[PDB]
């Protein structure tokens, strides 16, 4: 037999419902925040991610690559569709789909607000990342933020790292050595970025936290929560779950921050932007560890047990009827004995059951047995759709 | 600039909503029929589809392949998870996701009922293929069926399936010439056609599928019988277009907050957070613009209502909630805002 690829899993019927619940809930939340969904191809030109991955000179020897994350593609689409010129700004977009980093296949969800550097925007995305997780009932969350200032602060902070490291530059590998001159931060005792926020940067950050205080969102400032990528500006954050059944008891549920320089590396405008990404798998596991259950009703409303051909052929029209009316119903293919049909009813979670036989077919009346209370209710056969509908 | 791969397209904010409407309607329909969703990886061992395509010796020089369709993967899962031994049969499963054929990326949706060769089951899937399309308002549908008998070749099977179709009141066209060469395609083979002047021939194939006995074994599995069908969400979308159909979408903002100066604006931030925590779709103005500009954005976003918070309103604790269509204002206390919108 053929086996799935390594580091790959199928989401089978027991879990698919949990995924759809989560996915649907996120689409709704985005509705309140007004972020719109975009769906990028599974692969992009290798040259987008060039700026391990599954690359293959296919597409006519052209090099393509299974996307490892959705930001570059949201940016590649934003640029290609000339969104910078959109009358509606900031461009508030979200995505949700499988990513591929050599599980080799994982499902990340994320948002990107591009075109509006503004503390109130940051606050909106932070209140949101909190809202998402709290909407599911998670509770031992802990939002951690920091600021790496603007492009100015970073320029003057980089110089300090060079003043610092350079006099011992040869003690570093050609790797780290090369990096003194392009971005010392990647070299990282020595200076800290957060001690270089200018006056403006220090007020943006103070406004972001002001807002968090306003909205009553608790946060932890972790001066050491920084990002080396020079196109990463201002707000940086990580949402975390305190949970003892974790490797080291703590886990990062979500993460993100602002950026200024990303778009230009992808051949685009100097737009500013903020976003975050989150894994549905991890969210799912968080609910697990916290011992949380989702309102996934996954139950058949009516299972039809039939006796003999006449009654059975009637169950066919009936089923078609009920299904055309939003009732979840199912009958017995496989032709089995009542015990077997009744068990199937039970297996499928049939809230109710009915046994149609020829006597019921004539009297035009069946007993609808509530499978939990085991209480029957006698109604006319015609009522069936009506009775279940209402 | 870097460009999208050839024969590939993005589903931007104006369409993603149409996709979600359809996708969501299909999961519900599947609910009534009792088909459960399964999600297979984007790629499989080349050797499954081996039984052009994007194949690459990755995964550690191992040969993998971007799946071209979802049937062999549902069967690969079915076998690997030893579903044949499941107490609940037939295995009724569905899927919906991107497929890759050398648009190179297309999004096919489909069902598979495995383990119960039975006319009443074929009837159930044909009634469904008709239901799905009818649920969206399409109207010039035309179900075409045929049967290629059993592997020994049945007739009565086929007469029963059509018996049922007649029972159910489902009209069909028997096309003797609608057959499939694959010897594991046992009985019924069908296609849902849509007659519409816009397509060449003035008809198009919306959906297609049928039974099979021999597929499972090629994939190293049991001799289970199975029926199924596949469908393109893109084509379905286009069908609604051609028939001139609109979906009950219209993503429209509930409230756009226009603010005057810092005080008012910093108030709009708690307000927003509040409303959003209550199922109200609201948005304010980042980008700091003139009222005319904020008012246009409100219009741009489809804001059903609008409010302008400024310091005077901030003290009087009262604002005029103008209905953006009638242009009629309603003055309420600022506190009511959330309560009033809820």
Curated annotation (Swiss-Prot), chain A:
The record's disulfide annotation reads: 173-176
- Write down the SUPFAM superfamilies for this protein, in alphabetical order: Class II aaRS ABD-related, Class II aaRS and biotin synthetases
This protein's GO cellular component annotations are:
cytoplasm
Give one Pfam family: HGTP_anticodon
Localisation per UniProt entry:
Cytoplasm
Enzyme Commission number(s) of this protein: 6.1.1.21
- Reactions the enzyme catalyzes: tRNA(His) + L-histidine + ATP = L-histidyl-tRNA(His) + AMP + diphosphate + H(+)
GO biological process assignments: histidyl-tRNA aminoacylation
What's the chief localization of this chain? cytoplasm
Q: Which GO terms describe its molecular function?
A: ATP binding; catalytic activity, acting on a protein; histidine-tRNA ligase activity; transferase activity
The main enzyme category here is ligase
Gene3D superfamilies membership: Anticodon-binding domain, Bira Bifunctional Protein, Domain 2
Which family is annotated? Belongs to the class-II aminoacyl-tRNA synthetase family.
Subunit organization: Homodimer.
Q: What protein name does the entry list?
A: Histidine--tRNA ligase
């Amino acid at each position: 037999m053929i086996k799935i690829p390594r580091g790959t899993q199928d989401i089978l019927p027991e879990d698919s419902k949990k995924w759809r619940y989560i996915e649907n809930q996120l689409d709704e939340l985005m509705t309140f925040y007004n972020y719109k969904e975009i769906r990028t191809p599974i692969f992009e030109s290798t040259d987008l991610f060039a700026r391990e991955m599954y690359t293959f000179k296919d597409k006519g020897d052209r090099s393509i690559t299974l996307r490892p994350e959705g930001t570059a593609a949201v940016v590649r689409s934003y640029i290609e569709h000339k969104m910078q010129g959109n009358p509606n700004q900031p461009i508030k977009l979200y995505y949700n789909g499988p990513m591929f980093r050599y599980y080799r296949q994982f499902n990340q969800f994320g948002v990107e607000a591009i075109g509006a550097e503004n503390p109130s925007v940051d606050a909106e995305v932070l209140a949101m990342v909190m809202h998402i997780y709290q909407s599911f009932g998670l509770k031992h969350l802990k939002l951690v933020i920091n600021s790496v200032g603007d492009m100015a602060s970073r320029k003057e902070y980089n110089e300090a790292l060079v003043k610092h490291f350079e006099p011992v530059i040869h003690e570093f590998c050609s790797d780290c050595q090369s990096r003194l001159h392009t971005d010392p931060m990647r070299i990282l005792t020595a200076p800290r970025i957060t001690d270089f926020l200018n006056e403006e940067s220090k007020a943006y950050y103070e406004q972001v936290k002001a807002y968090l205080d306003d909205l009553g969102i608790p946060y932890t400032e972790d001066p050491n929560l920084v990002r080396g990528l020079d196109y990463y500006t201002h707000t940086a954050f990580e949402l975390m779950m305190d949970n003892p059944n974790y490797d080291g008891a703590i886990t990062t549920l979500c993460g993100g921050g602002r950026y200024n320089g990303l778009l230009e590396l992808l051949d685009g405008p100097s737009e500013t932007g903020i976003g975050f990404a989150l894994s549905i798998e991890r969210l799912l596991l968080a609910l697990e560890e916290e011992g949380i259950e989702l309102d996934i009703e996954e139950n058949l409303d009516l299972f039809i047990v039939t006796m003999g051909d006449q009654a059975d052929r009637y169950a066919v029209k009936l089923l078609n009827h009920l299904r055309h009316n939003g009732i979840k119903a199912d009958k017995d293919y496989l032709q089995r004995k009542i015990k077997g049909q009744m068990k199937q009813a039970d297996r499928l979670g049939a809230k109710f059951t009915i046994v149609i036989g020829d006597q019921e077919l004539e009297n035009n009346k069946i007993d609808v047995k509530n499978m939990t209370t085991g209480e029957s209710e006698t109604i006319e056969l015609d009522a069936l759709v009506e009775y279940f509908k209402k």
